[PDB]
Symmetry: C3
Subunit: 318 residues, 3 copies
Amino acid sequence: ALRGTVTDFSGFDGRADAEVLRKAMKGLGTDEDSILNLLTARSNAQRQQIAEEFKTLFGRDLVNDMKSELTGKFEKLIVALMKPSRLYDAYELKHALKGAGTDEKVLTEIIASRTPEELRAIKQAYEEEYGSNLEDDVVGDTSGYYQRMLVVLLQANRDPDTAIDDAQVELDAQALFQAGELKWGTDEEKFITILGTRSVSHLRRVFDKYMTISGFQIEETIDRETSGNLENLLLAVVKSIRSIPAYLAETLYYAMKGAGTDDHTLIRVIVSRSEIDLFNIRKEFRKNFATSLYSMIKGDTSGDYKKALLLLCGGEDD
Amino acid sequence: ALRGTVTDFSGFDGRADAEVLRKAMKGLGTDEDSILNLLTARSNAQRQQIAEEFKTLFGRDLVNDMKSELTGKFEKLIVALMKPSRLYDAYELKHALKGAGTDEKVLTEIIASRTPEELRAIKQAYEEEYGSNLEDDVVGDTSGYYQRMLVVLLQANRDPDTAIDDAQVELDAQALFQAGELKWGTDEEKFITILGTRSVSHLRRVFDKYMTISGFQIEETIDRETSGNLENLLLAVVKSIRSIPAYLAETLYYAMKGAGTDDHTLIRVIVSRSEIDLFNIRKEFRKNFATSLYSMIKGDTSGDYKKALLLLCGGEDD
Amino acid sequence: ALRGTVTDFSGFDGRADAEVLRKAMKGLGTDEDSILNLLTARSNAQRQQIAEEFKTLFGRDLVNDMKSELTGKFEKLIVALMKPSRLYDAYELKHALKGAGTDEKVLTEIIASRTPEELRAIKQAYEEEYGSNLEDDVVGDTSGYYQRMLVVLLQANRDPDTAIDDAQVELDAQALFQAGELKWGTDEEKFITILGTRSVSHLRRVFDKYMTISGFQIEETIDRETSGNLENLLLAVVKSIRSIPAYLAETLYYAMKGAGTDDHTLIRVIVSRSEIDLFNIRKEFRKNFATSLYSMIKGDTSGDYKKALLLLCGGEDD
Ligand SMILES: [Ca+2]
Ligand SMILES: [Ca+2]
Ligand SMILES: [Ca+2]
Ligand SMILES: [Ca+2]
Ligand SMILES: [Ca+2]
Ligand SMILES: [Ca+2]
Ligand SMILES: [Ca+2]
Ligand SMILES: [Ca+2]
Ligand SMILES: [Ca+2]
Ligand SMILES: [Ca+2]
Ligand SMILES: [Ca+2]
Ligand SMILES: [Ca+2]
Ligand SMILES: [Ca+2]
Ligand SMILES: [Ca+2]
Ligand SMILES: [Ca+2]
Ligand SMILES: [Ca+2]
Ligand SMILES: [Ca+2]
Ligand SMILES: [Ca+2]
Ligand SMILES: [Ca+2]
Ligand SMILES: [Ca+2]
Ligand SMILES: [Ca+2]
């Protein structure tokens, strides 16, 4: 069902690859083409083995050498590709967490779209890597119901998918109606408990029943009742419940539509999802925006950066 | 044989309880009665689950919210009740360790009265929680034979209880007599080795034989030969060897007898022992002081603090 | 095949030994003879148990007490003997790593002469003890091809010994000839890959074939082509490949030959190897320098220090 666009290279020889990369950087100048052709054709785990063979053969750190030879958005993409998959989301969160400068978009995007199993692993990686508790750091740099909903999601304690109870679907749809549209102001607490903790399959049914009862999609109510970071988080949670690939496809769309490109977001989504569901993302992107993800990247980016992204994405004729 | 006064609540529903606690704190004011009635009727492990459900439902930290709503001795008691049992003794030790301000009474009380199995667990919890070695911190803030005896006990290497060797009982009783009463000055080293390392059952016999030989109880010799912190520690060790519940009952007695109350000690003993031997402690208290622990607490304390302590203790008609 | 000079004492009683050591230090003055006779006759693991029994009996730290009673080179030797074997090499490396003051001789000696299995264990011990990554610290305080070769060795990824391929022996011997003697300047990279990563048994054959082709021993080429720290490291690697005991015997020889003694090196080699191959080292020493290691130590050292070293080494009539 879920498919990435990068898989293990058949006939992999990490030592041969390390030699190719050394040759690409040795002496004056840099062969960026050899680097991007190789690294985009190896899985993350294979990149780690290449880095180990490179240090064994040459006593040099592969990532440090590439940071010395490469520049600009290409360098940023290559660095992202070399982060072990188990650490990459933690790395992005750590870098989003910076006091008044906190990048809420990143916190929202990752925490809303990762499964409880993924969040458990991220929390552990973050603690091991940075010596800090993710929840503590998030709490320190956020406030209000936005913080509260993030903490709920960080518990990674969403109800498991089990048989649907129709009376429970009715009760929760009515509860949301009473907490929002029928209330002067908003009972955010009720929204957070229901959206944060009920099972995915249960909530998909609640969203349909809510539309039946109220005449609004839950996303319309959220825009009507809330604003600011809480609004963006609740929408990301609802969209992820409906379809993580669709939510991430939408995220890529907005990173590219308009003047320039949100390169940070483009790199993060493509790299983080490349071995999970980037294929599904391409399919949702084409369905919803009548263009290929490929053509939009092709139009928005330049140089070796563009070339590497296109190889990672694929789907020329999506 | 050993019985606490708090046990797991039958029919426990952590999510229901979390909702009750939220309702108790939500909005202006605080329902302290609902909080103390619930938390004193749940075991420590159940309190931890309640805290997890509360954060899952509401994205709020239960202990932090209670610290915001509560005040005074009641707050201090509730905070103590919410500490995981596996960390509580380590927490009290950490807080006793403060340079010139070191609270020797706490070091003595805990280290003398905990079993080797308990001390092994405390040492590990302390290291994990605080990133420091307990023995190192104790050494830094104590000196002299007091320090040495604490280090001996911290090794948690007391001889196991095995069949009693009567000639060994004679030898050790005579050794103690020669090291103290018959010596100009005192051979503290000999007292520390024998009291610190021999088995409990062996030492109970040595104490009786020592009385036979010398005409003094070992506690009388200790008062005659030593003073200061070393005296208090040796007495706590001997009393704990005779009966941990009796030693702790005596500790509670002195925390309350006289002007006011040592509230810190009252909270620590009641909470730390509530699921181990607080029932035995009540029994020893009644035996030795002709009053119930309940009535003494009832007489010495006020308000919600008093109410919560009484529910934890029980034994109205001891 | 490999034999130390110190082994477990038969009939070991750690508690009896702890009492002997206490008696040696108790009161004014110190019985250095009782200390050195006992500790040199116990294995490292037995010394650790003695330290534990000493703290259990007396509440005193054995190593700290000995640091208080002893002085000079004797103290330094006793401290080295008490370090757990699993930490000693890490301890020496940590102490060699000091910015501009870095002791390259120690880095070279340990990293060249330890097996991949040993280096894996050292890296782990270092990280656990000091909270730092050994490779990172080495990189910070070294530079150039010297650093690179150290990093290669630190990977502990040397090819396993397997059946010898004669054509591979020819290829590598010719490669080294082309990289050094036939090249204007030197291809250090090629030397580092081959010497750092090929199997020991393969390299022993390459060294013989290299002599056949070039008329030089590889050590002669290294002196002809390189200098400085890289030279010393490549020679230590080649000598260790030929024979670790021989390399370490040579290291001891130079620590003593000439005005005075390199006491730090003498202590490190004797203690670190005492339970691994110090017997083989003695044999190589006698073979290569026509004197006993014993007689050279006897001639170069004084006092209790001399006595303890001689007991550790043995081999009076080597
Ligand atoms: Ca280059
Ligand atoms: Ca170029
Ligand atoms: Ca760069
Ligand atoms: Ca409303
Ligand atoms: Ca409102
Ligand atoms: Ca809005
Ligand atoms: Ca654009
Ligand atoms: Ca309130
Ligand atoms: Ca109130
Ligand atoms: Ca408060
Ligand atoms: Ca006396
Ligand atoms: Ca005295
Ligand atoms: Ca006294
Ligand atoms: Ca009182
Ligand atoms: Ca002395
Ligand atoms: Ca002396
Ligand atoms: Ca000294
Ligand atoms: Ca040359
Ligand atoms: Ca050159
Ligand atoms: Ca030279
Ligand atoms: Ca000399």
